[PDB]
From Swiss-Prot:
Residues 2-95, 271-272 form a propeptide. The record marks F88, Q89, E90, Y94, E95, A96 as: Cleavage. Keywords: Cell membrane, Cytoplasmic vesicle, Disulfide bond, Glycoprotein, Host-virus interaction, Hydrolase, Lysosome, Membrane, Nucleus, Protease, Secreted, Signal, Thiol protease, Zymogen. Zn(2+) 7 binds at D257. GO terms for cellular component: apical plasma membrane; chromaffin granule; collagen-containing extracellular matrix; endocytic vesicle lumen; endolysosome lumen; extracellular exosome; extracellular region; extracellular space. Belongs to the peptidase C1 family. It holds the Pfam family Inhibitor_I29. Zn(2+) 2 binds at E145, E181. This is Procathepsin L. It catalyses: Specificity close to that of papain. As compared to cathepsin B, cathepsin L exhibits higher activity toward protein substrates, but has little activity on Z-Arg-Arg-NHMec, and no peptidyl-dipeptidase activity. It comes from Homo sapiens. Zn(2+) 3 binds at D166, D209.
Length: 314
C-alpha cells in the first residue's frame, strides 16, 4: 500500500529516480520514497527557516535523497595517529591576502565524484598533489584516486572503507609515482593494484602537517596552494547543502568524517561574522555550489576544518 505519501511530489519523485538511475528491488520503492519525502520536508523546513533569517545557507535535494543513514555511513568514514610530516614553517614578516582562490590561477581540476565509496581521503590527496605539481611545473593533470584506493593499503589505507591523506602522500613517495586519472580511471570500488610507471605523472618528496589552528591554515592556503583537510560532514545540513556559508551548530571540531580540499578563503560581507573557507568537495557538481562549499572560517575551528590539515611536497 501507498505509505502516506505526498501526492503533489509524485512527478518530482518519478523524475528524481530517473535522473539518478534508481532501479529499486522488490518492495523497495515505497520505503525509499518515504526516505526521500522526509528529506524533502527537512530541506523545505530549513529553507523556510533561512527565509526567516535563522541560517546562513540553503539546502537542496540531490543524489543522496533516498539514502539511509546507514548507507550514508558507508560513504563517510571517520578520521583519527602520529603526526609524521615535516614541520610547517610559519611565513615570517608576512600578512596573507584578505581573499585567496587558487582556482583562478589554474591550480584546481574540475570537481569529481567519489560515488558510493568511502574514498574522499583519496580525492583530498589528489587535489593537493594536483595543486603542488602545478605550482612546480605549471602543468595541471588530474591524478588517479583509483590508484590510491587500490594500491595504498600497505601505507594504512582501507580503500572504500577509508584512509588518510598523509598515507596517500606516503604511498606516492614509496611508489615513486602516481598515474594520471586518464590512465587509471575511477571505479568507485576497491580493485587489485594496477599502477603502471609508464603512466606516472606525479611524485612527491613527503608531506607537511599544518598545526591545528585556523590562522596557520590560512597562512598555508595563502602561500602553498590547495590544502587537504578533514571535517565533520556527518549532518544532513551538509549532505544537502546548496549555497551560502555553511554553519552547523552541532558541528564538532573533532569527530571528523570527510576529507575535502581547501582552495581558498574570503569574506562574504566585511571583516568576524562572515568569513569563509572555499572548499572543493568530491560529491560532483550537482552538490553545493558547483561542487564547492563555503565553510565558516575563524569561528572556533568550525567542523574541525583546521584539525587535520596537510599537503605534499613535490
Amino acid at each position: 500500500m501507498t505509505l502516506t505519501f505526498d501526492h503533489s511530489l509524485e512527478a518530482q519523485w518519478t523524475k528524481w529516480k530517473a535522473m539518478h538511475n534508481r532501479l529499486y528491488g522488490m518492495n523497495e520503492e515505497g520505503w525509499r520514497r518515504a526516505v526521500w519525502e522526509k528529506n524533502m520536508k527537512m530541506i523545505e523546513l530549513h529553507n523556510q527557516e533561512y527565509r526567516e533569517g535563522k541560517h546562513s545557507f540553503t539546502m537542496a535535494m540531490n543524489a543522496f535523497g533516498d539514502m539511509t543513514s546507514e548507507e550514508f555511513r558507508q560513504v563517510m568514514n571517520g578520521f583519527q595517529k602520529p603526526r609524521k610530516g615535516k614541520v610547517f614553517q610559519e611565513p615570517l614578516f608576512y600578512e596573507a591576502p584578505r581573499s585567496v582562490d587558487w582556482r583562478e590561477k589554474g591550480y584546481v581540476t574540475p570537481v569529481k565524484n567519489q560515488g558510493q565509496c568511502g574514498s574522499s581521503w583519496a580525492f583530498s590527496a589528489t587535489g593537493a598533489l594536483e595543486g603542488q605539481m602545478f605550482r612546480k611545473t605549471g602543468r595541471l593533470i588530474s591524478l588517479s584516486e583509483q590508484n590510491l584506493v587500490d594500491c595504498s593499503g600497505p601505507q594504512g589505507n582501507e580503500g572504500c572503507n577509508g584512509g588518510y591523506m598523509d598515507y596517500a602522500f606516503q604511498y606516492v613517495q614509496d611508489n615513486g609515482g602516481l598515474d594520471s586519472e586518464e590512465s587509471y580511471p575511477y571505479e568507485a570500488t576497491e580493485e587489485s593494484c594496477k599502477y603502471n610507471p609508464k603512466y606516472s605523472v606525479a611524485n612527491d618528496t613527503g608531506f607537511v602537517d599544518i598545526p591545528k589552528q585556523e590562522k596557520a591554515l590560512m597562512k598555508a592556503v595563502a602561500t602553498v596552494g590547495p590544502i587537504s583537510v578533514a571535517i565533520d560532514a556527518g549532518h544532513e545540513s551538509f549532505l544537502f547543502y546548496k549555497e551560502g556559508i555553511y554553519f552547523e551548530p552541532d558541528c564538532s571540531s573533532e569527530d571528523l568524517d570527510h576529507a575535502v580540499l581547501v582552495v581558498g578563503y574570503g569574506f562574504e560581507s566585511t571583516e568576524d561574522n562572515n568569513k569563509y573557507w572555499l572548499v572543493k568537495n568530491s560529491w560532483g557538481e550537482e552538490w553545493g555550489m558547483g561542487g564547492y562549499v563555503k565553510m565558516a572560517k575563524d569561528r572556533r575551528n568550525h567542523c574541525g576544518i583546521a584539525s587535520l590539515a596537510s599537503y605534499p611536497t613535490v
